[PDB]
Write an enzyme that holds these catalytic residues in place. Sequence first.
Site, PDB file in Angstrom:
ATOM      1  N   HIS A  83       0.619  -1.202  -0.037  1.00  9.65           N
ATOM      2  CA  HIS A  83       0.181  -0.422  -0.119  1.00  9.65           C
ATOM      3  C   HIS A  83       0.747   1.441  -0.067  1.00  9.65           C
ATOM      4  O   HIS A  83       2.060   1.175   0.004  1.00  9.65           O
ATOM      5  CB  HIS A  83      -0.950  -0.218   1.138  1.00  9.65           C
ATOM      6  CG  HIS A  83      -0.067   0.391   2.374  1.00  9.65           C
ATOM      7  ND1 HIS A  83      -0.265  -0.879   3.362  1.00  9.65           N
ATOM      8  CD2 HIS A  83      -0.408   1.258   3.617  1.00  9.65           C
ATOM      9  CE1 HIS A  83       0.274  -0.993   4.634  1.00  9.65           C
ATOM     10  NE2 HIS A  83      -0.099   1.017   4.561  1.00  9.65           N
ATOM     11  N   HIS A  85       1.738   3.946   1.982  1.00 10.51           N
ATOM     12  CA  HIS A  85       2.045   4.426   3.424  1.00 10.51           C
ATOM     13  C   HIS A  85       3.733   3.602   3.281  1.00 10.51           C
ATOM     14  O   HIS A  85       4.232   3.334   2.459  1.00 10.51           O
ATOM     15  CB  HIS A  85       2.034   4.087   4.718  1.00 10.51           C
ATOM     16  CG  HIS A  85       0.153   4.113   4.607  1.00 10.51           C
ATOM     17  ND1 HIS A  85      -0.367   3.382   5.553  1.00 10.51           N
ATOM     18  CD2 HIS A  85      -0.617   5.737   4.200  1.00 10.51           C
ATOM     19  CE1 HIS A  85      -1.662   4.229   6.021  1.00 10.51           C
ATOM     20  NE2 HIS A  85      -1.512   5.443   4.959  1.00 10.51           N
ATOM     21  N   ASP A  87       6.119   3.197   5.457  1.00 11.19           N
ATOM     22  CA  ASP A  87       6.415   1.578   5.550  1.00 11.19           C
ATOM     23  C   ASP A  87       6.474   0.844   4.415  1.00 11.19           C
ATOM     24  O   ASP A  87       7.781  -0.099   4.531  1.00 11.19           O
ATOM     25  CB  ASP A  87       5.276   1.370   6.832  1.00 11.19           C
ATOM     26  CG  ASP A  87       4.200   0.950   6.970  1.00 11.19           C
ATOM     27  OD1 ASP A  87       3.051   1.566   6.268  1.00 11.19           O
ATOM     28  OD2 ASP A  87       3.756  -0.090   7.263  1.00 11.19           O
ATOM     29  N   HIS A 148      -7.195  -1.821   5.864  1.00  6.50           N
ATOM     30  CA  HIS A 148      -6.243  -1.007   6.945  1.00  6.50           C
ATOM     31  C   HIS A 148      -6.153   0.747   5.607  1.00  6.50           C
ATOM     32  O   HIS A 148      -6.106   2.018   6.038  1.00  6.50           O
ATOM     33  CB  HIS A 148      -4.413  -1.500   6.879  1.00  6.50           C
ATOM     34  CG  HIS A 148      -3.779  -0.368   7.229  1.00  6.50           C
ATOM     35  ND1 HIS A 148      -3.422  -0.119   8.576  1.00  6.50           N
ATOM     36  CD2 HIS A 148      -3.112   0.362   6.560  1.00  6.50           C
ATOM     37  CE1 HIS A 148      -2.838   1.164   7.632  1.00  6.50           C
ATOM     38  NE2 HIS A 148      -2.065   0.846   7.756  1.00  6.50           N
ATOM     39  N   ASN A 179      -2.355   3.283  13.314  1.00  4.62           N
ATOM     40  CA  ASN A 179      -2.827   4.535  12.055  1.00  4.62           C
ATOM     41  C   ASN A 179      -4.279   4.078  11.283  1.00  4.62           C
ATOM     42  O   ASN A 179      -3.945   2.680  10.185  1.00  4.62           O
ATOM     43  CB  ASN A 179      -1.670   4.331  11.356  1.00  4.62           C
ATOM     44  CG  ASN A 179      -2.114   5.398  10.744  1.00  4.62           C
ATOM     45  OD1 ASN A 179      -2.271   6.051  10.746  1.00  4.62           O
ATOM     46  ND2 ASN A 179      -1.034   5.434   9.279  1.00  4.62           N
TER      47      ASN A 179
END
Length: 231
Positions: A83, A85, A87, A148, A179
Site C-alpha cells: 500500500h 504508506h 513503511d 487498513h 494508524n
Amino acid sequence: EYPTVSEIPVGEVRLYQIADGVWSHIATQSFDGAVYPSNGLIVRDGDELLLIDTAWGAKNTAALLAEIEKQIGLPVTRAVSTHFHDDRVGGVDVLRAAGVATYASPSTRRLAEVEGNEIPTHSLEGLSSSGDAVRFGPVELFYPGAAHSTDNLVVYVPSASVLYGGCAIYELSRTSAGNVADADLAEWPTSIERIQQHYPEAQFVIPGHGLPGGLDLLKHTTNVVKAHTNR
Ligand code: NA
Ligand SMILES: [Zn+2]
Ligand SMILES: [Zn+2]
Ligand SMILES: [Zn+2]
C-alpha cells in the site's frame, strides 16, 4: 526467536527465515518519541529474489539491501509495495537507483503521489476489484477490499503456505487501533473474511507490524477493528 522491536536499533535490519526460500525483514522507526517495528517479505524466485515492501525509509532500505547481499547473496530484481504508506514505499527511490524494478497497483501509485510519497515505477494490473488475484513470480497477489487502506494488498507464497497480510492484519499483542487515518473501518471485517476464504490453508500469517502467528490473527484483527468502530 522472532526479533522484537526492542532488539533492533533504528537504522538496522534483521532477516528471519520463515520457511525454505521465504524470509521476513524487520526494521524500526521512531514516531512521537516511541519506537515501532515493521515487517516485509523476501521470496526466492529461482536464482533471484522478490522483495515485498521497503524497510520504512531510505536509510533502512539501503541497510536491507546490504543485509540481503551479505546473508542471502542473490539479486533483488523486483519489489512490490502493498500500500501507499511510507513503511511500504519509503525507500522505493533507493531500490530504483539500485536497479530493482518497483511495482504497485495503480491505486497505490495514485495515493502515494497524492501523499507526496515515493512512487513505484510499474503498475500491477488485475487487482482493481475486491477478490481479484494475480500470480507474480513465486507469489500470488490478492486485493481483499478496503481495510487498513483502500489499496491494501496481501501476498501468499503457495510453496510455503505463508500469508503476508501486511497492515490489514494486526499482531496479537496489538489491542487498539493503529494508524487508521486512511482506513475503511466499515469494510475491513468483510475484507478480512475474503482473505480467510481465499487462504484457509495458510500456516504462517505475517502482520505488517509485529509478531507472526497463525490464521487466528485474522479474527483478532476483526475484533480490534469492531471494538474501535464502537469506540
Ligand atoms: Na488464489
Ligand atoms: Zn499503512
Ligand atoms: Zn522497469
Ligand atoms: Zn503499516
